[PDB]
């Protein structure tokens, strides 16, 4: 069938959308060539709808079959649990988009008369109706990039909040359990950064001849069809679960997950949807199963040898024994058209890499680095380009979600985000106060409440005091780096030095745990290094929960 059919009427955006990078003070002195950064809105929203709007090609085979079966075996030994009401409200972030049923997540959090009351009957109904299609949104996502030598919107797809609270006591727990139950090491959301790149090292490291490469699917959303969804529905049906559970999974899979009407922001039906919606609970785990059984199974009918994949969503990794050359060439090309008759079409034309660093996924990849005892310590890292782009914009215009936040967290040990990010954010916190205010990030899509003061004890915890330490980085990461700034019209590395070091002096000066950060956010910046012992309050931390399953599109908070 086609992933999309539309009315005519148009993607709208619900109030002024800003495209342009203002002209600050404050993110001038981080980029200059304001001009090269854009935010997508609505206006490119055609050209999305272009993209994802075609009719799919399916055909499964034993291959596919077999392994599905090996998924629900594995799925069979999971029980999941029921959400309370209360438990589903406590998961809504405060900035998620109120119901058009008079309340707003405020309420839901608060455990409001109306909203919990309205929260009940949408219950009520997902067991009583196992057929209405219910009603979704469709808005242009708001993303900003540099711009290439530009990309349309992506389109967003989301149900009612009151829906999106029945979606978590339903499937909250499933979506948190299930993935890991049934991919074991292959399910990537498990990961915090450095056991990523553990796994992928040892990975790497455990075959004779390794050989890998990164999948790229066409829009993958698009290309889950409406079969893809209700065998994905059968694995959930595989674990143990309460009466009403069972019935809201089967409800919501036939009237919002396999597809349902699009409703713009000014209320006009804009069409039909018959493929993954971005903005629900199972959309994460729902791509993560999907990838990797067609992968999996790709796997198999390509006679590719001791596979070992690592899947996030729709981002696909493999590492395999080379068979040559030629022989692996061949191989991923069988893969390619194994996954093509699956419903998972190339994007980017797959090839593969014998040099593990050369490898990109998740936007990101396995480099070296040097710790204090000068021994080899591999970290992840990624082009800064996206990262300080979006840093500006943040800089310049206040934004719910601080992603230059969660890529200090993520990227702490790379070369950018210590000399580049902690400078210029410490650097404005410190002019304006604001050292000690919470700030919301996301972290493998989930939203979390972060205190810039804590950073060296999450860092620690994390990455190890390694990431204090790193140094004698290698050429290429330093050329990537230095090239991009040069794109962006950042200022080279050498004044982020000069300016580090100035962070550096007035945060020791405050002391406390400020103090603490300019001994071990910036100890890099000075030729005299201090003794960077493990922190106290870091080996107490509850980081158990960040790196469990992902949850983009998910409306989860975690607090
Ligand atoms: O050690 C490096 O690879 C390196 C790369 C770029 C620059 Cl500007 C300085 C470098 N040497 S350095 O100042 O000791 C340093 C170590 C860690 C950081 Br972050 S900066």
Same mark, same amino acid.
């Given at each position: 069938?086609?992933?999309?059919?539309?009315?005519?009427? @148009?993607?709208?955006?619900? /109030? &002024?959308?800003? !495209?342009?990078?203002?002209?600050?003070?404050?993110?001038?002195?981080?980029?200059?060539?304001?001009?090269?950064?854009?935010?997508? =809105? $609505?206006?490119?929203?055609?050209?999305? #709808?272009?993209?994802?709007?075609?009719?799919?090609?399916?055909?499964?085979?034993?291959?596919?079959?077999?392994?599905?079966?090996?998924?629900?075996?594995? /799925?069979?030994?999971?029980?999941?649990?029921?959400?309370?009401?209360?438990?589903?409200?406590?998961? +809504?972030?405060?900035?998620?988009?109120?119901?058009?049923?008079?309340?707003?997540?405020?309420?839901?959090?608060?455990?409001? !008369?109306?909203?919990?009351?309205?929260?009940?009957?949408?219950?009520?109904?997902?067991?009583?109706?196992?057929?209405?299609?219910?009603?979704?949104?469709?808005? /242009?996502?708001?993303?900003?990039?540099?711009?290439?030598?530009?990309?349309?919107?992506?389109?967003?797809?989301?149900?009612?909040?009151?829906?999106?609270?029945?979606?978590?006591? /339903? @499937?909250?727990?499933?979506?948190?359990?299930?993935?890991?139950?049934?991919?074991?090491?292959?399910?990537?959301? #498990?990961?915090?950064?450095?056991?990523?790149?553990?796994?992928?090292?040892? =990975?790497?490291?455990?075959?004779?001849?390794?050989?890998?490469?990164?999948?790229?699917?066409?829009?993958?959303?698009?290309?889950?069809?409406?079969?893809?969804?209700?065998?994905?529905?059968?694995?959930?049906?595989?674990?143990?679960?309460?009466?009403?559970?069972?019935?809201?999974?089967?409800?919501?899979?036939?009237?919002?997950?396999?597809?349902?009407?699009?409703?713009?922001?000014?209320?006009?039906?804009?069409?039909?949807?018959?493929?993954?919606?971005?903005?629900?609970? +199972?959309?994460?785990?729902?791509?993560?199963? =999907?990838?990797?059984?067609?992968?999996?199974?790709?796997?198999?009918?390509?006679? @590719?040898?001791?596979?070992?994949?690592?899947?996030?969503?729709?981002?696909?990794?493999?590492?395999?024994?080379?068979?040559?050359?030629?022989?692996?060439?061949?191989?991923?090309?069988?893969?390619?058209?194994?996954?093509?008759?699956? $419903?998972?079409?190339? %994007?980017?034309?797959?090839?593969?890499?014998?040099?593990?660093?050369?490898? +990109?996924?998740?936007?990101?990849?396995?480099?070296?680095?040097?710790?204090?005892?000068?021994?080899?310590?591999?970290?992840?890292?990624?082009?800064?380009?996206?990262? @300080?782009?979006?840093?500006?914009?943040?800089?310049?215009?206040?934004?719910?979600?601080?992603?230059?936040?969660?890529?200090?967290?993520?990227?702490?040990? =790379?070369?950018?985000?210590?000399?580049?990010?902690?400078?210029?954010?410490?650097?404005?916190?410190?002019?304006?106060?604001?050292?000690?205010?919470?700030?919301?990030?996301?972290?493998?899509?989930?939203?979390?409440?972060?205190?810039?003061?804590?950073?060296?004890?999450?860092?620690?915890?994390?990455?190890?005091?390694?990431?204090?330490?790193?140094?004698?980085?290698?050429?290429?990461?330093?050329?990537?780096?230095?090239?991009?700034?040069?794109?962006?019209?950042?200022?080279?590395?050498?004044?982020?030095?000069?300016?580090?070091? !100035?962070?550096?002096?007035?945060?020791?000066?405050? %002391?406390?745990?400020? &103090?603490?950060?300019?001994?071990?956010?910036?100890?890099?910046?000075?030729?005299?290094?201090?003794?960077?012992?493990?922190?106290? &309050?870091?080996?107490?931390?509850?980081? !158990?929960?960040?790196?469990?399953?992902?949850?983009?599109?998910?409306?989860?908070?975690?607090?």
């Amino acid at each position: 069938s086609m992933s999309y059919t539309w009315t005519g009427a @148009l993607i709208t955006p619900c /109030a &002024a959308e800003e !495209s342009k990078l203002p002209i600050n003070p404050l993110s001038n002195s981080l980029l200059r060539h304001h001009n090269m950064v854009y935010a997508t =809105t $609505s206006r490119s929203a055609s050209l999305r #709808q272009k993209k994802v709007t075609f009719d799919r090609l399916q055909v499964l085979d034993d291959h596919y079959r077999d392994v599905l079966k090996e998924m629900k075996a594995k /799925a069979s030994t999971v029980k999941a649990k029921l959400l309370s009401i209360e438990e589903a409200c406590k998961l +809504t972030p405060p900035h998620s988009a109120k119901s058009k049923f008079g309340y707003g997540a405020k309420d839901v959090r608060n455990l409001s !008369s109306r909203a919990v009351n309205h929260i009940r009957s949408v219950w009520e109904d997902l067991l009583e109706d196992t057929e209405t299609p219910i009603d979704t949104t469709i808005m /242009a996502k708001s993303e900003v990039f540099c711009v290439q030598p530009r990309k349309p919107a992506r389109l967003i797809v989301f149900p009612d909040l009151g829906v999106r609270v029945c979606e978590k006591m /339903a @499937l909250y727990d499933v979506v948190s359990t299930l993935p890991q139950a049934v991919m074991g090491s292959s399910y990537g959301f #498990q990961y915090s950064p450095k056991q990523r790149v553990e796994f992928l090292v040892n =990975t790497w490291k455990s075959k004779k001849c390794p050989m890998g490469f990164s999948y790229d699917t066409r829009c993958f959303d698009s290309t889950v069809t409406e079969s893809d969804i209700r065998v994905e529905e059968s694995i959930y049906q595989c674990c143990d679960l309460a009466p009403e559970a069972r019935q809201a999974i089967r409800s919501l899979t036939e009237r919002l997950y396999i597809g349902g009407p699009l409703t713009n922001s000014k209320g006009q039906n804009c069409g039909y949807r018959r493929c993954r919606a971005s903005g629900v609970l +199972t959309t994460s785990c729902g791509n993560t199963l =999907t990838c990797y059984l067609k992968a999996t199974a790709a796997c198999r009918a390509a006679k @590719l040898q001791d596979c070992t994949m690592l899947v996030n969503g729709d981002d696909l990794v493999v590492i395999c024994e080379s068979a040559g050359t030629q022989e692996d060439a061949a191989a991923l090309r069988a893969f390619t058209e194994a996954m093509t008759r699956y $419903s998972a079409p190339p %994007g980017d034309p797959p090839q593969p890499e014998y040099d593990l660093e050369l490898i +990109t996924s998740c936007s990101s990849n396995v480099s070296v680095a040097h710790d204090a005892s000068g021994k080899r310590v591999y970290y992840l890292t990624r082009d800064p380009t996206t990262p @300080l782009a979006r840093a500006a914009w943040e800089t310049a215009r206040h934004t719910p979600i601080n992603s230059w936040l969660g890529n200090i967290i993520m990227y702490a040990p =790379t070369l950018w985000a210590r000399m580049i990010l902690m400078t210029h954010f410490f650097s404005i916190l410190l002019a304006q106060e604001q050292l000690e205010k919470a700030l919301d990030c996301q972290i493998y899509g989930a939203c979390y409440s972060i205190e810039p003061l804590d950073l060296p004890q999450i860092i620690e915890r994390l990455h190890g005091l390694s990431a204090f330490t790193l140094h004698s980085y290698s050429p290429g990461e330093i050329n990537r780096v230095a090239s991009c700034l040069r794109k962006l019209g950042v200022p080279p590395l050498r004044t982020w030095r000069h300016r580090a070091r !100035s962070v550096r002096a007035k945060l020791l000066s405050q %002391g406390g745990r400020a &103090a603490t950060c300019g001994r071990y956010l910036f100890n890099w910046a000075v030729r005299t290094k201090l003794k960077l012992t493990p922190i106290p &309050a870091a080996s107490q931390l509850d980081l !158990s929960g960040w790196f469990v399953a992902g949850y983009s599109g998910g409306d989860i908070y975690h607090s």
